[PDB]
């Protein structure tokens, strides 16, 4: 037994030495976003938003217990989706646009069918294979989904059957965030262990683990390339990892920031790294300078969600002030 | 504004009149979070007053035409610091503690500190259902375990003046129970900035009047938050 821990420590030392040996531009400017829309109607805490693939439609999950589908141009309630578990912590929009997935404190991930022949948005499948609260759900294709839960597990599900094609069980804490890759072949997560992990979706095994943080991890999103991602943490810093380098790149913190990040979303070109924070406001970091490119200070409570269109036109933020602002430039 | 777009700004308004219907329901029903431990008895608390792999267990009950939630956090994991944030903007936190096992009493005190000093649970008042007081009563009536083993400061501690013993109560058990309650009020008075107070309570498994206690407590939190909003307090 003791020799086992000795060998494990030796292997960890080898990993650290390999990573250490492996390691070896005009500013964006003050970006301002004059809230071209302001999307009110949520009755309670907002926790999650996800863009549609058309850069127009948008769903937001709020902890009243209702998903709301809005038209980002004319600010209309396209659909109204009541739920059964009010404690929603994630939401997703399927690329086809037919389905949306929401998950929260209850261990289930419910699949909601938009483009139905009878008219009303209705359920498609309930996924019930967990023992901890679900914190991030993402549609792979129309018939596949990936969910990260409270118990130390990520998963890949077959929506038609309703069973995990593969379970991912390498973590040691509550998995908070989850980001499918551009090619839908990989995904990364942060799991309240200061340990972000990369996974393979077909073989069913964790490929890499990154340990830059010094506290929990709250949000994660792939770079639009698919060879990197960033993690948000309660230690008041964001970090940038590279998959192939298997290391840390940058940390996103300044001495005036005391509170932790809760929602990270990249830019479509990846140059702007928006980040939600506890201190009632967002920030935009130029993800290659780690500087404060600007502040989306428009909220009266903790930002909780953040996302950027597939066209790069706009970005939407929602704090628990029950408002989901939509932001864009000018001129 | 085209004919199809004119109907796009119309169904949006019929959904407005549905979200302005649920706002009345949402703000006319108060939420509560229940917290505790393995032998605390919150399961027995629910089983007593609810009747009058699921992540969260709901509970419905109303007293005097006011509807109350109570979210018992069930088949979750040992850690607590990421699903406890979801219970901000809640009316109160009920925190059942078993004070008849001094080994876990200090752990319950640590949990109370964590709830009380939490950054998001700083505007959230707590209803402490100090549970199963009778077990703590025989824990000292047939005195075999010395409380001063884990509590040397109990030696030079006397019954508080404002104590109101139940009829037919030995003074020593009064000393012990008010002692533990005082340990649970010390954290309360230590910090909080008056925006949220702690509400001690002497509860057991068969305490059949808990609902009024949550009712009165919640009325007190809302009265005091308005009275501070009016700078009257």
């Amino acid at each position: 037994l003791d020799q086992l821990r000795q060998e494990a420590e030796q292997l960890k030392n080898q990993i650290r030495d390999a990573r250490k040996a492996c390691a070896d531009i005009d500013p964006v400017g003050r970006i301002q976003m004059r809230t071209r829309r302001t999307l009110r109607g949520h009755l309670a805490k907002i926790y999650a938003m996800h863009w549609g693939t058309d850069s127009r439609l948008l769903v937001s999950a709020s902890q009243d217990g209702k998903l709301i589908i809005w038209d980002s141009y004319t600010t209309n309630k396209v659909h109204a989706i009541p739920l059964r578990s009010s404690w929603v912590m994630t939401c997703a929009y399927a690329p086809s646009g037919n389905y949306v997935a929401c998950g929260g404190l209850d261990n289930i991930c419910s699949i909601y069918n938009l483009k139905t022949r009878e008219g009303n948005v209705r359920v498609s499948r309930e996924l019930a294979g967990h023992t901890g609260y679900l914190s991030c759900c993402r549609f792979l294709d129309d018939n596949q989904i990936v969910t990260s839960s409270g118990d130390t597990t990520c998963a890949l599900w077959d929506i038609e059957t309703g069973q995990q094609t593969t379970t991912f069980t390498g973590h040691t804490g509550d998995v908070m965030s989850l980001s499918l890759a551009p090619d839908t072949r990989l995904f990364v997560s942060g799991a309240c262990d200061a340990s972000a992990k990369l996974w393979d979706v077909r073989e069913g095994m964790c490929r890499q683990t990154f340990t830059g943080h010094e506290s929990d991890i709250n949000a994660i999103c792939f770079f639009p390339n698919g060879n990197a991602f960033a993690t948000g943490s309660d230690d008041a810093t964001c970090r940038l990892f590279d998959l192939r380098a298997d290391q840390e790149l940058m940390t996103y913190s300044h001495d005036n920031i005391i509170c932790g990040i809760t929602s990270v979303s990249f830019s479509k070109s990846g140059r702007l790294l928006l980040a939600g924070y506890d201190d009632f406001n967002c920030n935009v970091w130029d993800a290659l300078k780690a500087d404060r490119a600007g502040v989306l200070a428009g909220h009266d409570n903790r930002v909780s969600c953040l996302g950027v269109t597939d066209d790069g036109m706009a970005v939407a933020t929602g704090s628990w002030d029950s408002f989901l602002k939509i932001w864009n430039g000018s001129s | 504004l085209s004919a199809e777009d004119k109907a796009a700004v119309e169904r949006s308004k019929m959904i407005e009149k549905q979200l302005q219907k649920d706002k009345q329901v949402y703000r006319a029903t108060h939420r509560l979070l229940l917290l505790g431990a393995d032998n605390s008895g919150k399961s027995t608390i629910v089983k007593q007053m609810r009747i009058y792999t699921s992540g969260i267990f709901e509970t419905k009950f109303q007293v005097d035409k006011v509807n109350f939630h109570m979210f018992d956090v069930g088949a979750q994991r040992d850690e607590r610091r990421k699903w406890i944030q979801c219970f901000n903007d809640v009316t109160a936190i009920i925190f059942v503690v078993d004070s008849s096992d001094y080994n876990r009493l200090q752990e319950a005190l640590n949990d109370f500190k964590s709830i009380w000093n939490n950054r998001w649970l700083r505007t959230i008042s707590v209803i402490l259902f100090l549970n199963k007081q009778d077990l703590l009563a025989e824990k000292v009536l047939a005195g075999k375990s010395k409380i001063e083993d884990y509590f040397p400061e109990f030696a030079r501690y006397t019954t508080p003046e404002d104590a109101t013993p139940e009829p037919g109560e030995d003074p020593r058990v009064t000393r012990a129970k008010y002692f533990i309650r005082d340990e649970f009020l010390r954290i309360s008075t230590a910090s909080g900035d008056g925006r949220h107070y702690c509400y001690p309570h002497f509860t057991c498994s068969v305490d059949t009047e808990n609902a009024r206690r949550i009712f009165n407590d919640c009325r007190d939190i809302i009265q005091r938050m308005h009275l501070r909003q009016y700078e009257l307090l």
Partner: single-chain antibody
Amino acid sequence: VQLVESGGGLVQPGGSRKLSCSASGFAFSSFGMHWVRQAPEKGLEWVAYISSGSGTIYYADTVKGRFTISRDDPKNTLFLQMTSLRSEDTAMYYCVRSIYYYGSSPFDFWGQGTTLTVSDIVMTQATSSVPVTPGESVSISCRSSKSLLHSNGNTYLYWFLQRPGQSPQLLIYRMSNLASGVPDRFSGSGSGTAFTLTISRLEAEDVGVYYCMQHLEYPLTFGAGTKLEL
């Protein structure tokens, strides 16, 4: 989805007859309910319109002042009130569900229809009969009175087919889209005032009359109707 209705038939000439629509199988309360009739040998012409929420009601200018539309959500039914029909009111009527949001397909489902017989953009279809062989590419055109491309990219022309024995159906909505149970052969385009419908490879079930609807500005108007003979 099932829109079944009746009501017409025999009544004292110059009298009143109420047309219903027994909707079944869909979320009625969220849909807009139109009406359309058909001249016994000629094309269609709009009748009435009740919108979601029973707030917006538009009518046919020919009989605007005297037709009476209505609806009743909590029983998923519809009603239409005719009063003292003239001799021009000999036609056969249709019931239509429609719903309007980003990406929706209005006029997606056309009811089965009922007869009622008692004794402004304008669409022109000078083409009325065309011979064609199966497996060959064919096209049918409809022309309008003005433009239909609105400021938001839409085109507001609904292509159609009335199969030789039953009710119309959506082939393309807004000049470029496709319905639910419709093959991928169909396709259409618009020039700015004139349009055309293209079928890549004809088969047996693509015979009949093709219609054109605009929706940009009321009233709604159809074309003449181009019958295809194989």
